[PDB]
Design a protein around this ligand. Structure first.
Ligand SMILES: Cc1cc2nc3c(=O)[nH]c(=O)nc-3n(C[C@H](O)[C@H](O)[C@H](O)COP(=O)(O)O)c2cc1C
Length: 399
């Protein structure tokens, strides 16, 4: 069915439909598909789903000139911990990623791969099974109750990375970025948000280190900035993006409670613009809005009003993708895009609406999303969401 009490608004007369050049890509519009994990990858090997992946992506790349950021992809076995999320380290995986990159490209859209590293958000037991450690910034602070239960049951205690294991992670980031570009991706996005590894190093709650990687604004951002620099040297700055979520609290992150949280992020944004001047400006900065502090809360829940992402604009002068509960709020989007260098990421509604872009331009109703198939080893709730036309033929009230 269609979203019940939603009053759509045509957005065709806005900047959301003015082209823009991101990296090497020329988008025909500014609605991007943010990284969305769907757990359809195949175990063993974290192989992208051979039966449905191409269809799903092909479906969402139908409106020409769309920028698509893929589901988080593990850069190595030690970076993972979820049996059904895809990896981007082996041939067996790249052979399937290529097919996917081709379908999107044939539809004249673009694709950026999100390099993912779990940290304490991984399942300690899955990692122990395969002989991998349970990594994180520190070892005297854990994610949550059941994470420490799982960890000790599996006897795979949270481990504080040594300076050498951090370098090894940097090695793997480069190799995975290279494999992705080599396989034909338009670029890669470094996920330094949502409480995953890098975010665990940025956060003063999860990072209680005393070495060169903790203890100050400058040290907490170190790991993240070294990944940036390394990838920039390896494949070029116009092929790299950085995702941040300043006020997010998902996965045990601080958010607005940390008085020094804004300074932590303003510093990162500044160093980025520093390099921008030195010629090496990243493709973009992706920000998770405080409108959604937790992606697993219904729209309107976990909304932070004591803080704003606007400070980034004062520091970073490049393109900025903002994601978070924008689909059901065209009036909000309408104002946000008045700014000339802003893109909007639509998450949850790009799951249930393969033709979102067209429904946004024309102000047509929105298909509801089934929360239950977000993470299911099924085609149902993955590739069977109908386009507006099909929804009509089905009689989602308008026959
Ligand atoms: C099913 C699902 C999977 C997601 N997977 C990822 C992911 O792989 N990496 C990431 O950085 N964010 C992920 N997100 C967060 C989204 O990118 C987005 O920022 C968030 O859903 C807020 O946007 P929305 O209100 O338009 O859905 C996910 C969200 C959902 C609901």
């Amino acid at each position: 069915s269609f979203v019940k009490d939603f009053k759509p608004q045509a957005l065709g007369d806005t900047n959301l439909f003015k082209p823009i050049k991101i990296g090497n890509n020329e988008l025909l519009h500014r609605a991007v598909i943010p990284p969305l994990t769907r757990m359809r990858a195949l175990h063993p090997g974290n192989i992208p789903n051979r039966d449905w992946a191409v269809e799903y992506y092909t479906q969402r790349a139908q409106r020409p000139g769309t920028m698509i950021i893929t589901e988080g992809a593990f850069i190595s076995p030690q970076a993972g911990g979820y049996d059904n999320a895809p990896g981007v380290w082996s041939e067996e995986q790249m052979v399937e990623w290529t097919k996917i990159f081709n379908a999107i490209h044939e539809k004249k859209s673009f694709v950026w791969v999100q390099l993912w590293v779990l940290g304490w958000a991984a399942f300690p037991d899955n990692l122990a099974r395969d002989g991998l450690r349970y990594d994180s910034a520190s070892d005297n602070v854990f994610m949550d109750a059941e994470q420490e239960a799982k960890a000790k049951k599996a006897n795979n205690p949270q481990h504080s990375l040594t300076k050498d294991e951090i370098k090894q992670y940097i090695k793997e980031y480069v190799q995975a970025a290279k494999n992705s570009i080599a396989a034909g991706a338009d670029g890669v996005e470094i996920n330094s948000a949502n409480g995953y590894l890098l975010n665990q190093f940025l956060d003063p709650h999860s990072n209680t280190r005393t070495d060169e990687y903790g203890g100050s604004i400058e040290n907490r951002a170190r790991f993240t900035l070294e990944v940036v620099d390394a990838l920039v040297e390896a494949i070029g700055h116009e092929k790299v993006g950085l995702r941040l979520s300043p006020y997010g609290v998902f996965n045990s992150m601080s958010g607005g409670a940390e008085t020094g949280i804004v300074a932590q992020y303003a510093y990162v944004a500044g160093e980025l613009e520093k390099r921008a001047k030195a010629g090496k400006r990243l493709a973009f900065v992706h920000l998770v809005e405080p409108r959604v502090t937790n992606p697993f809360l219904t729209e309107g829940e976990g909304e932070y009003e004591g803080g704003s992402n606007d400070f980034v604009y004062s520091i970073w002068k490049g393109p900025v993708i903002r994601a978070g509960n924008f689909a059901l709020h065209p009036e909000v989007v309408r104002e946000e895009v008045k700014d000339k260098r802003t893109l909007i990421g639509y998450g949850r509604f790009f799951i249930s609406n393969p033709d979102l872009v067209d429904r946004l331009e024309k102000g047509l109703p929105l298909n509801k999303y089934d929360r239950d198939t977000f993470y299911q080893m099924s085609a149902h709730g993955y590739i069977d969401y109908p386009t507006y036309e099909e929804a009509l033929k089905l009689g989602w009230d308008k026959s």
